[PDB]
Amino acid sequence: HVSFPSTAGKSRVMIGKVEPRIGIDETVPTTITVEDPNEVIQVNFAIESTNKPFQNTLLIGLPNKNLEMAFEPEIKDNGKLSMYKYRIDLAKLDAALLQEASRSPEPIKATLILASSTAKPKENLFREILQLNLNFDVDHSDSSLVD
């Protein structure tokens, strides 16, 4: 079958902006990132289904500092169409991530993995899909997780 991803950001925190901008090698990417405006649940769409899912995960956070949170999707299959839902809560993120994203100006990256065992090599997709640029103020100096 063919899948389609829908990453929905609840965004309890007010300020938020998704600005996908990356240039990488050919890793079986075929979709194009599109952002749909809405009131609260501002969902982003993708048709980036090129391999078969045996593991399907969304890694959010800072990769260069080894701060990764993993998210599991909600599957709904209708024949050929396999829709994936990726609920991302901006208030349920762990404090150790926000307390570091507030200070460091670097954006929080978000990539997804859709690999499988039987899939032939050099086509299992491992690509970056979002660069969230958080531009508000959070708490610090009181309960910092770095300590």
Binding site: Q55, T57, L59, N66, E68, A96, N124, L145
Partner: protein
């Protein structure tokens, strides 16, 4: 103390002792696996995952061989000293329908 473990060898006393320290190893069934690996036969961990310079600092890139490993979760205190990491893609998958012990580079 030096201490070893594996999904084929998980002493209960060792698990309880480590849990008392702050380290949480995986249980018997769960085993780590990584599809993005140069050698499918066993686990090959790249020397780029070293996390603490004083223990061992790689003069040159190399590949450490592991087989049927079992990653561990770590609490957040000042005594624990992470020395190696697991590749971001890797994940622990148990035989039964139990949730994955550790996902991503957290293991």
């Amino acid at each position: 103390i030096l201490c070893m473990s594996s999904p084929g060898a998980v002493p209960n006393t060792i698990r309880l002792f480590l849990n008392e320290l702050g380290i949480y190893p995986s249980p018997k069934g769960h085993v780590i696996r990584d599809y993005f690996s140069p050698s499918s036969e066993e686990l090959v961990v790249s020397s780029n995952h070293l996390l603490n310079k004083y223990v061992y600092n790689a003069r040159k890139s190399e590949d450490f061989v592991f087989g049927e490993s079992s990653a561990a979760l770590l609490e957040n205190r000042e005594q624990i000293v992470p020395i190696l990491n697991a590749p971001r893609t890797s994940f622990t998958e148990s035989k039964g329908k139990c949730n994955s012990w550790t996902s991503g580079s957290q293991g």
